[PDB]
Amino acid sequence: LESVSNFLKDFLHKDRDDVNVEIVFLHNISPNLELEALFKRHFTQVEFYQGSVLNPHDLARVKIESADACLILANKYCADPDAEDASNIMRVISIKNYHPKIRIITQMLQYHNKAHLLNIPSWNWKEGDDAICLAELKLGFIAQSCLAQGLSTMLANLFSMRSFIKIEEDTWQKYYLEGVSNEMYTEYLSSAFVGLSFPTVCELCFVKLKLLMIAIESRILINPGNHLKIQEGTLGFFIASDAKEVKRAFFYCKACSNVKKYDSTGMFHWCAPKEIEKVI
Amino acid sequence: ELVNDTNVQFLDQDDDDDPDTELYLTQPFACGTAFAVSVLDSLMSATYFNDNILTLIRTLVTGGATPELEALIAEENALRGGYSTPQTLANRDRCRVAQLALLDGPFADLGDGGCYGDLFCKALKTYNMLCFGIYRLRDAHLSTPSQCTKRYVITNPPYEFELVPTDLIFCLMQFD
Amino acid sequence: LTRSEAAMTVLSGHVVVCIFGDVSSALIGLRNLVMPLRASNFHYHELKHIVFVGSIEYLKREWETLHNFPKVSILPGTPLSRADLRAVNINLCDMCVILSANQNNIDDTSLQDKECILASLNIKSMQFDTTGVNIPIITELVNDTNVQFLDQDDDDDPDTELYLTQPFACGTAFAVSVLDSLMSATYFNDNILTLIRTLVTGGATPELEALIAEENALRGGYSTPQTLANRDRCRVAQLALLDGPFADLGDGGCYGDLFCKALKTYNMLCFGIYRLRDAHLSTPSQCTKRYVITNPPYEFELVPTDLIFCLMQFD
Ligand SMILES: [Ca+2]
Ligand SMILES: [Ca+2]
Ligand SMILES: [Ca+2]
């Protein structure tokens, strides 16, 4: 109940669309207590089945062959994080060993265990297999909040699918629930934007078509400088009230040196390895 | 960091508390003073429906760690130092997240009740600053002054939106 | 050794033993791994060097059992570390052995073999200035059903007995459950366990059992003509069918002719072939995996790629 309830109320959220995708669950234990009730509340598109993802007959029942993606949830409160991530990697290799081409999304409790996930020969992040490391993102959101307070709640509100809620009283909740109503979305830029600099299309798409643009696929960059002009076929990341609103970004066409200061690639500052007695 | 998001009710006393409220509505979360790993549960569903999202979050949050960095750390288990080169130096030229105070000379004249959209347009076109939200004082809508220093987060203000001189601007700013 | 010392030590043709182990964990009995590799049938230059990679805390309470064998080293580390595997030249060994002491501390069928499966995958995925998928590995499994995770170009099914599976047929997995039929084999014929013991232990005699039972350690002695005559046993070896004395018969020619000449000219007595998994296909393949043929039936063809299992004389 404490793991599926936050997942279900976002996946089956009314504001995205009225589509049917999620229809099956599997686990070695029976779904006793206040959990079958949460399945009753979604009867037409949940269907729990009893079986273990380590067994290829149970993978064959739930039709892993054409299951689109598999989602693996971690026990966030477990006594041994490294045993959990090894266990969930056993599930990943079980699923990939049964079927090469299913997409897999998995929670990892520790950062280092994401290396092990890259050893599997049938895993490729270039085709949308990925791991959500909870320690990496948790401590990362806190770290960026040390640069700007409130950023960790800003980011956490950009993923969760939420509708706009109207408030009539002039309290702080009125302006907050307006800002909560948007999500991170992405779309390919219209050919009308090709050949001109990123700040200029940001000002155009904010002013004329009410979309905030953040980043572009120059593999993946964030708020690129005024010297960077847009190529054809670039993906462009947006903040918007709803997915149907980002479509205008595509449909628009005029109309209306002797010492080591850094790590080996210059991404981070670095120093020679200190002794702990030097920093206590 | 909270292990149980229901315990968030104890972090503040000038708030209002109720066991059925979802964490995102609560004052200490809206102000950015509490975090719980349960807010990342919806990152599973967000990443299923759009694979690009987790890539953006990762680059924005980790300090821009690349697939090459993942490989070096996976081999050597520690961050390994290197000597300067023009390419090692060009790798510094990313944006970084920052807060701007609307009491400074280049923006305070627009911090008089003037529009967020005008601030966005000029800060973007003159500095490549791209603001994406404001951190407003909890009581700034009241007619009375207050001793309350708490701020709360506004994400993507809708244009025609007023700037009080007390506001802090969330922005992405260039290296130099 | 520290990593730097292992890295400048030119380890090649050696054995790497990867041990998952800890101060709480039961004794593996490593003397029994080292002794067959220290038989006086080998010349001192023919001895494969042995490196233990694992917790030193664990090795520290076993090593006095194997502190009288010559070519032995320890690297304090973890088999999941690519840096440790590189420091011991894992691309150059004749075998990598993967063991766990932690077999008995949780029983959940999944939890028993995680480390060994991750370790073998971590060695397979390596890159060197070649991929690591060609490296010879043998993995001890606590649950023979977990064998399905060791390979991915195989076919897996929960009702298959271990002996049919690709990783077992290729000689890359072992499970103590295959010795359960040694009970029934030894009831029906008492001589079998005597043969297995002499063939496998490095020929330990009843006199050796008595000396070890008294003194609890292997005790050194000075040379004598009888101590030297005791070296003249056979030893098991693999012969490559690309060498001059046999390659002319490795053209599709008969195993029986190879057996007859190798027996009569060298007293070599071959007893099986290790054939490439794909050698029956008309297409070439990149697959380096071999599988075991025991007692080939005469009139049986030798492809030039085959390795011959044989018993060869001392000299
Ligand atoms: Ca939202
Ligand atoms: Ca409270
Ligand atoms: Ca398999």
Swiss-Prot record, chain B:
Instruction: Specify the superkingdom.
Output: Eukaryota
Q: Which residues bind Ca(2+)?
A: Q9, D12, D15, D17
Annotated segments matching region Segment S10: 29-49
The disulfide bridges present are none
On subunit structure and binding partners, the annotation says:
Homotetramer; which constitutes the calcium-activated potassium channel. Interacts with RAB11B. Interacts with beta subunits KCNMB1, KCNMB2, KCNMB3 and KCNMB4. Interacts with gamma subunits LRRC26, LRRC38, LRRC52 and LRRC55. Beta and gamma subunits are accessory, and modulate its activity.
Disease named in the record: Paroxysmal non-kinesigenic dyskinesia 3 with or without generalized epilepsy: An autosomal dominant neurologic disorder characterized by absence seizures, generalized tonic-clonic seizures, paroxysmal nonkinesigenic dyskinesia and involuntary dystonic or choreiform movements. Onset is usually in childhood. Patients may have seizures only, dyskinesia only, or both.
Q: What else is known?
A: The protein was initially thought to contain two functionally distinct parts: The core channel (from the N-terminus to the S9 segment) that mediates the channel activity, and the cytoplasmic tail (from the S9 segment to the C-terminus) that mediates the calcium sensing. The situation is however more complex, since the core channel also contains binding sites for Ca(2+) and Mg(2+).
**Notes concerning its domains:** The S0 segment is essential for the modulation by the accessory beta subunits KCNMB1, KCNMB2, KCNMB3 and KCNMB4. The S4 segment, which is characterized by a series of positively charged amino acids at every third position, is part of the voltage-sensor.
Name assigned to this protein: Calcium-activated potassium channel subunit alpha-1
Question: Taxonomic lineage of this organism?
Answer: Eukaryota, Metazoa, Chordata, Craniata, Vertebrata
Tell me the name of the encoding gene: KCNMA1
> Whole protein: which stretch is covered?
1004 to 1179 of 1236
